[PDB]
Amino acid sequence: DSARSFLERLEARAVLAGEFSDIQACSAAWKADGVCSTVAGSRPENVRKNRYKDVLPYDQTRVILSLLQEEGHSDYINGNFIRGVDGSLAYIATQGPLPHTLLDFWRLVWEFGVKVILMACREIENGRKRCERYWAQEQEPLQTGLFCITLIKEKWLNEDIMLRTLKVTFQKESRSVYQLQYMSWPDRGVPSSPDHMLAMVEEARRLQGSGPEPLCVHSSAGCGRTGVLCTVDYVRQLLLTMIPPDFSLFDVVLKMRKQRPAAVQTEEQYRFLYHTVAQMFCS
């Protein structure tokens, strides 16, 4: 019924451009009202840790790193928690690590028991370095600080997605971490295969199994492509789990944008979210 009525409301009614422009107004207001601030991200000791000057994590929901803290390590990383459907910390949306934030990225993974990492960008995008390789090659393990990262096996989930089985070691404890990377999803755009994107989410959920640990989700800035993944996964859970009878995609995206800046970056990605959700409900 609830999924059904959602499509009815869609059919009763392609703008949408109006709705997303209203999402932008709400964002600008949260910043005017100081309900979303970027104080920790602007600190002079943290600025170099931001990939982009215009993308800072909100103080209210930022990931706070306490691991190695006794050693004098900063609590800071450009990343935010996003709440899941049950109200728990389901996602961590973070930027593509820089050469000097690789260690912080692994502190994050380690401290929060992360099992699955979703990557929605490439290392090199427009002739530009967009993300550092943080995973291991079969042929070179990766070392930052006290962590040793090791590639066990690689395969393709499908033509667009690489599934890497990683081992990470820290102080004699060992954990498996899975990374799924989506290869052909540009910036401000949409993936080449909405179906493959769904499969990525499907596989991430299988690998995640039970357990309260959040999915780690990133792209280059940790905004547009990251926010689309989180939103897709969030709405899938709603369905598998609980779709409200007044269910609104406008409210979901608003909620996301309140936790991670510009989560869902462009009108095009917003329309894409609608097409995807609509398809998902038909089945």
Binding site: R51, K53, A221, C223, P261
Partner: peptide, 6 residues
């Protein structure tokens, strides 16, 4: 190569 979005 400095700025992403807004």
């Amino acid at each position: 190569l400095q700025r992403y979005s807004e």
